[PDB]
Amino acid sequence: TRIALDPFVSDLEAESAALRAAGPLAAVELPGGVPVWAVTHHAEAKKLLTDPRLVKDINVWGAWQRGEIAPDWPLIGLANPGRSMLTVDGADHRRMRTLVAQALTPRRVEQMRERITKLTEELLDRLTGEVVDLKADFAYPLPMYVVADLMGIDEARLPRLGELFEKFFSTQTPPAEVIATLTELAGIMAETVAAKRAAPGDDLTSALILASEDGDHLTDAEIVSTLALMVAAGHETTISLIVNAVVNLSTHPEQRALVLSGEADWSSVVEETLRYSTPTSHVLIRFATEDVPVGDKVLPAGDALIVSYGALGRDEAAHGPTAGEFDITRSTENRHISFGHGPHVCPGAALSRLEAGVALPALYARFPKLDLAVPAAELRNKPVVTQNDLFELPVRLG
Ligand code: HEM
């Protein structure tokens, strides 16, 4: 009675339905036969996400310590990454989040609005033809241009960043080359940090250099790992938020009419796309330092936990009987947690909300009739078991 997640992501909708039914704590098999628990309901996910007995420290994973995880397990990169804010808990983690919060402020993000608007305008200007891949031609490049500008990365490097991003995120890149791509990316981040130390500017890298709490400040390695982690965490997720928003408005034409007519705001489209169709279906990975009761079940000490954000987005207990449907007019008692909850909560939430909040109205203001060039059912998930990404978004601009 263990739900094996399909690594080709052939029926995300059925899998999510299965996970909710088997919850709040579902027995799951990750691709390559690795057993873990998934928290698949809203209330229980929030409790676990704030429970200090669920940690990122891979030492705690009994199966890992006992040499039972194949060294070439495809997901070993996700489960065992290099040290960053991502892999720490407790006082070490609070220190990093405090310093990062001084740099990636709500105001720094809001101040990007005009630059995101200009980048969006230039991408829309280049759209030609009656039907286009909106992902490749519009959604894909926007967050790369935005994060490079945010981080103060040399504009000259943008052609190489596009090559590095494509390799990093491609389902075809072998692990050795993903590692070499990440090494070159970290080298670009190190060069950016060394330049901003000499010539401080109004950019996130300069702000991460400057951040301090009673004399304490990030080391060069922590700044580089933070910048590299923000690229890895923020690129395809933001792309998929924009993509999924256009798919949701395309398959719900009466709600498209509400937003295009100004009766519903774009923010309601973005928030409902995040609950209903999060870019991030599962987050690896947490380990229990002791037995943790989850509903009528026990999560054993040394066992692994993934958070099934995709599944729990449509939790009827959180959102009421309509949880299973896209409705941009819904009021819920419970804000979605598609950006996480507790100490590891997404520090990029305002940025991805701003990119989508600028890009969607701009797109439909240029092409108010745009719609899918294929039936929804012909759209394909990429074989990335943790992500809700499409191979392409064929659109008729109109
Ligand atoms: C729609 C877009 C995005 C979604 C759905 C998303 C979702 C998430 C979630 C759910 C987590 C927490 C995982 C967990 O603890 O269970 C997270 C962490 C993170 N996100 Fe985001 N994210 C998005 C965009 C971004 C952006 C644009 C950035 C950076 C600028 C970013 C940077 C991070 C980082 C650095 C972490 C690790 C935080 C930590 O562990 O302390 N994300 N994201």
From TrEMBL:
<protein>
    <submittedName>
        <fullName>Cytochrome P450</fullName>
    </submittedName>
</protein>
<comment type="similarity">
    <text>Belongs to the cytochrome P450 family.</text>
</comment>
<dbReference type="InterPro" id="IPR001128">
    <property type="entry name" value="Cyt_P450"/>
</dbReference>
<keyword id="KW-0560">Oxidoreductase</keyword>
<keyword id="KW-0408">Iron</keyword>
<dbReference type="GO" id="GO:0016705">
    <property type="term" value="F:oxidoreductase activity, acting on paired donors, with incorporation or reduction of molecular oxygen"/>
</dbReference>
<keyword id="KW-0349">Heme</keyword>
<dbReference type="InterPro" id="IPR036396">
    <property type="entry name" value="Cyt_P450_sf"/>
</dbReference>
<dbReference type="GO" id="GO:0004497">
    <property type="term" value="F:monooxygenase activity"/>
</dbReference>
<keyword id="KW-0479">Metal-binding</keyword>
<dbReference type="Pfam" id="PF00067">
    <property type="entry name" value="p450"/>
</dbReference>
<dbReference type="GO" id="GO:0005506">
    <property type="term" value="F:iron ion binding"/>
</dbReference>
<dbReference type="InterPro" id="IPR017972">
    <property type="entry name" value="Cyt_P450_CS"/>
</dbReference>
<dbReference type="InterPro" id="IPR002397">
    <property type="entry name" value="Cyt_P450_B"/>
</dbReference>
<keyword id="KW-0503">Monooxygenase</keyword>
<dbReference type="GO" id="GO:0020037">
    <property type="term" value="F:heme binding"/>
</dbReference>
